[model samples]
Target: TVVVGSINFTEQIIVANMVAEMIEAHTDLKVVRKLNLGGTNVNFEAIKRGGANNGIDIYVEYTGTGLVDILGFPEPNVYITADKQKNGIKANFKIRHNVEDGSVQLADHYQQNTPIGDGPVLLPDNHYLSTQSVLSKDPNEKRDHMVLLEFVTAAGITSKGEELFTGVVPILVELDGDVNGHKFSVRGEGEGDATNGKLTLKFICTTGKLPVPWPTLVTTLVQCFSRYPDHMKQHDFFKSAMPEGYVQERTISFKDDGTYKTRAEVKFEGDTLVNRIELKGIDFKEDGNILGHKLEYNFPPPPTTDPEKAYETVKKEYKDKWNIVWLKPLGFNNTYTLAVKDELAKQYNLKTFSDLAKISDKLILGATMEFLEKPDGYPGLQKVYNFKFKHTKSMDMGIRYTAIDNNEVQVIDAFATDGLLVSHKLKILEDDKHFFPPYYAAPIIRQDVLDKHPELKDVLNKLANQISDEEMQKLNYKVDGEGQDPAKVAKEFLKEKGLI
Candidate 1:
């Protein structure tokens, strides 16, 4: 019997089920599934001691985890080696078997890929400076130099006195090059030889460190472009008028109460400002906590020899102050709720925690919380179920959720952008009035099973980039609310993204 052992997890079950179905369909092999093995060590022991005569012929494991967590090894030598002590049990066994067979091959006569030794293809030179060298020696200057180079290369404009400086001739040249190279072309122009054929073509590339264009440059350019409207009458001419294309104006309107709206417009001569406004005026509440009954924070003795009345009075007082409502009551303690109100505040154009505080006074904060209550007895609600509140607050606050932190907060959910936020330390504005729900979902997979099925790598890598915010939200709504099957949703999403 081919026994397939799996850890107790959704991913492991899915994988084991898939493998079993495949084996049944493709081969005449009878599969015996002894699923839901407790933990990694338990499963390992079961396999090692031959708990089942046909036990665990195949399983997945993470190489890094096996080396680090299982073997208690150091960082540099975590890689598998021939030496038993260095390689550990799994690594040593695999290497020994492969060597004995002269070359590792599948039963279908498929040979393993040959290993290519690692070395530099090109000789080292001053052209490629190590990051350490650049950072260690004159880091600020080196950083500024790199930034200047990037600006010059990317925007093709010279920085002059903290602003982009350009002569009329240089602007014309740059614009002409943009048109000719098709870096960006003018749209909405009608087709005709008289109008279209009159377009001029030129190419210009800029170099060297320069200044960033500021409000002053933008104001100056607006006047210049307005005065020389005739010079840029043609689409091509307009394109060449500015080396960086055009200046954009953004208007931020805030109410006295701290709520605000942001309006952005692209400014160019002879054309109306393209207005795009974003208004963020939503209120939220803070997720409150509950404690066990017997462990009340501050309680008083009963008066009139009536214990129930005293307890009721205490519960009412607690609820009024913290917006808590008691669900159940017992002798020592009661189940109460605490809810905090959130108000909308001002909006700003900053992209970090420091930036958020810089722009406005009122900031919004939000978090996910889990509620755990005792079922039968009094003082049942013993403890607050906080999943490392300190860690979440210290690390996951106000970085990505707020517009000011991301520099570009799309009308999208915050957690999806957590990677970008954490990488940048931008604060996510807290939802003080808990307008959003708290439902956290994560993917789980068996390390041992993954190792056995290396082909899963290709499938996962293909899926990594295809799923975006919109797709995930749609799938989430379906699975959570509509009662649609998660596996079906996943399969459909994978198929739509051409990943399956």
Candidate 2:
């Protein structure tokens, strides 16, 4: 009997299922599955000691992981040549393979050893490393300073409130108060339902003496004009009635064109007053659409000399016509190009970016090419063009290319943990860059056990190279994110690929 053992993971399950299915379909071999055996140590012990003295035939293992941990080998210098390490691991595999097959005589030809390496081993020319360095640096100093400033600002606002508005109004105001004693107010225009008139107020009060009642803050804020028609006239009184001490009122002005004109007024209560004013403007959004009507109305004739403004104008002009999709790589750190025409000939509906270009103008190709740019080249624009390029630090070229090829922008933007593609039911396009190097995928068999069942090698070898990244990603999405049974997906995939 041929027994295959798998660890607790989707890849392992898939591999085990694939082997079992192949054996059943191609040969009259009896196969048994030993799955989810234990943690790394448990599995290591099981394999090392030979399961119940019977000995494990074969197991999937990562070369890098095995070298660093299992072999007690220190990480070599990053620039070491692959040839120079012949004695270390390069020659060890050949020696081990020979011993297993020669002594055990598992089969006439033991060519079933498949090493599936995730992503590209060789570094791409466009790899970005600077961005990585910046991102890796600690931000504790900035965070601590921000916390300190927040506390000081909150204290100032509270002191100002105490001194300025002792008994001015009988309404309550609700300000944003946190556990750290930092407090402030967020202001905006408009009543509850109306979008026409400006609804500016001093503060959103939940209770205490303010313009609006605490219990009815939302309603009052929404119906500001209806509640007090004379709000504009009470501006000075409102300013004076601000809480005393070191209170700062961030006055936000609204313009007809949806631009915010903000002027921050900082003053000390019950002491010599120090007032400062600063102004800034920002675009407004209502009903999920940016209000750009004001721009067209105000600038009826486009300006000729401002390139930056022209670019914005052009972008605004075309923004409504295109459905923008972003994408980035996932799972592995390798850039692979799949020539859909050549590699994925069987998949008629799915095509590569280049293939898509032949059929439709609706598609927009993007990739994280930040890694390809020179250290000081125009990375900003390239990064903006592709979602993967948005990495604040260096870019992983292989990953960036994979994301670009996938053509799903949301996946690229999400931190790897988000797994947006898996959740969204989006298909990752096959890579056809012809840039990715070859990685092997073969089934491992125990030398001694193989001797008894020589046919297993030939049976399993027929299934090699049947699965690809596109297939694997879909299976992963089904099993990991959608909570589908891994065995089911494995069976379906093998059947679809004609392996079972």
Best by lDDT: 2
TM-score of each: 0.23, 0.33
Model 1, 1-500: lDDT tens digits are 44555667443343344334434444445667666457554444444333245456333322222222222211110111122221111111010001111122111110111111221111111110000000011244422121110000000000111012122211121111111122221111111111211211111123321121111011111111211112222212112322223222222111111111222222222322121222222221111110011111111111211333333543354234322222221111111221111111233443222333233222222321221111111011111121111111111444424543442332222443223333333334433222222211111123343355444333333322243333444555555546676556655654565444
Stretches of candidate 2 off by over 4 Å are 36-45, 51-55, 61-422, 425-441
How far is 282's C-alpha from truth in model 1 (Å)?
Answer: 60
lDDT of each: 0.26, 0.32
Candidate 2 has its poorest 10 consecutive residues by lDDT at 149-158
